Amino acid sequence: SAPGGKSRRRRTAFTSEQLLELEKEFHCKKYLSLTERSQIAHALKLSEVQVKIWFQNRRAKWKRIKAGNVS
């Protein structure tokens, strides 16, 4: 059963199916250089423009849980 979590701005036209590889690289390495980012982008059908903003999502995960503030 999926964990849900109703916060998601739809800002792209990718699918879980094209995303598989795009997440799979996190199991190879923690970082995707320009040459490396252009592999998956050219591996399926994706747009290196969108890849720029795809990284704007890579902070939400722990902030969902670590929803908290500073003095």
Curated annotation (Swiss-Prot):
Protein localization: Nucleus
Superkingdom in the source lineage: Eukaryota
DNA-binding region, residue intervals: 7-66
Protein name: Homeobox protein GBX-1
Species of the source: Homo sapiens
Portion of the full-length sequence here: 256 to 325 of 363
